[PDB]
């Protein structure tokens, strides 16, 4: 990469508090809005 990076990279799991009933639900309401429109 023709240079020494300023910083390292880590798996970006900082916001790990992501629920499964929440993620599906958010996708659900995106769909219903589109289905109706």
């Amino acid at each position: 990469i023709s240079g020494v990076s300023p910083l390292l990279y880590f798996p970006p799991t900082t916001t790990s508090t992501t629920n499964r009933e929440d993620q599906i639900n958010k996708n659900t309401n995106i769909a219903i809005q589109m289905i109706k429109r």
Partner: protein, 57 residues
């Protein structure tokens, strides 16, 4: 008693045949108006892509 009955009797066959043909015509028209409707619905791929945009990925 004699004349009108004889002429009605003579009429019967042609009328019967024409009415049979008319009924067959009605059935044929009923059949010809049947078409299978195919509806197009929004592809879910776009919905998934929009979901990604909301995810800010």
């Amino acid at each position: 008693d004699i004349m009108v009955p004889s002429f009605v009797y003579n009429k019967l066959p042609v009328i019967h045949f024409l009415q049979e043909k008319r009924a067959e015509q009605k059935l044929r028209r009923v059949l010809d108006e049947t078409y299978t409707e195919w509806t197009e619905e929004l592809d879910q791929a776009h919905v998934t892509d929009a979901i990604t945009r909301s995810l800010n990925i």
